[model samples]
Target: GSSGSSGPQKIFTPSAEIVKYTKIIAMEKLYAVFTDYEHDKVSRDEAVNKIRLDTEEHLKEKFPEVDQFEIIESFNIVAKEVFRSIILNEYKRCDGRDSGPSSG
Candidate 1:
């Protein structure tokens, strides 16, 4: 049997600023991509898949030595933020009420 362990695993801990920047960047990128989706420049599925894959790839590329947990968690947060922004920016009420309940 060949054991895979040759050395101890290294954990990367990023500073709060780094985490903040990563999340901001991810959210900005997602917003652009999602805007295209809303405008019919790209399909919904394409927008979603691109966001997921690009987040992972961009974070890994920018922070190659960063922890996987950090990348995954940041991506999750970014996705939520992007979705929220999209809904708030593009969603319109179809009801008869003027301005709708959430249009404030």
Candidate 2:
């Protein structure tokens, strides 16, 4: 998908399928880093914040409504569990992927 003010521009509208599975893909690709951090190989307490920023910065241009998506404060601690709980157990993650619905 492409969006631009003028001619011949490639924007960042990844497909819903791709977006839907992003977390799982990230979880897989970044597993080594996550695991290492978990084991204190190279510590990082700001990973969650960095992930939030990355998602917001990149996706906001295409999905302005992204900001309107709500997330509970408690989710900061257990985002995956929260996502799984709500969108999976209750509703099933859309597109059959393990990820949260849009979150503000």
Candidate 3:
């Protein structure tokens, strides 16, 4: 048996401004990604996956010292909320309106 003694774990907390910027950036990207999905330029799954990758890179650069798992987990929740809102509005529009998915 190996006895290991280590110091207490460090908790990382990002600034409120950092959190605000992260959410704003993710929401902007999600809007266009969802639009592209609606336009049939990319698949729905890929739209969310791309948003995750985009958010991951952003969080990594801004909070390099933070734990990847935790930050991503938190952002996954944030992204999904925005994504749902976008989907909701899109659905509401679709119920009464439609857009063309054609490009040259």
Candidate 4:
């Protein structure tokens, strides 16, 4: 059988940039203590405690207009982006992966 690429395509949505930046900020906040927790240098509670207020402050500072629901939405989006990035990078598809519709 013949078919097109059938894999995935990259398309731009309105909030793409927002999502990108949100992911960056979200990850930055977590990474500050992630390694410590991973290395057993910090407890789960300590790592979570360290990031909670900091994340709220960061989000409020950068996205003051985002309400509580939107904040949750942004967090979910960032989490997905992080997972996608890790998987793509692990498979060497970071540059080749398509996050949305294709050119065709």
Q: What are the TM-scores, per candidate, against the unseen true structure?
A: 0.54, 0.36, 0.58, 0.44
Candidate 4 at 81: error in angstroms? 2.5
Against the true structure, whose TM-score is highest? Answer: 3
Residue 35's lDDT in candidate 4: 37
lDDT by candidate, in order shown: 0.64, 0.43, 0.67, 0.55
lDDT of 1 by residue, 22-100 (tens): 6677677766676666556457668666766766676767777777677766666657766876676566564334555
Clashing residue pairs found in predicted model 3:
none
- For model 1, the stretches where C-alpha displacement exceeds 4 angstroms are 1-19, 39-42, 92-104
In candidate 4, what are the lDDT values of residues 1-104, reduced to their tens digit? 45455457543233343556666766765555443465575575576455445555666566676564455455665655565644554456336757798556
RMSD vs true structure, all candidates: 8.3, 14.4, 9.2, 12.8
Candidate 1: minimum summed lDDT over ten consecutive residues — where? 9-18
lDDT of residue 54 for candidate 3:
80
Candidate 3 local distance difference test against the native:
0.67
TM-score of 2: 0.36
How many residue pairs clash per model?
Answer: 0, 1, 0, 3
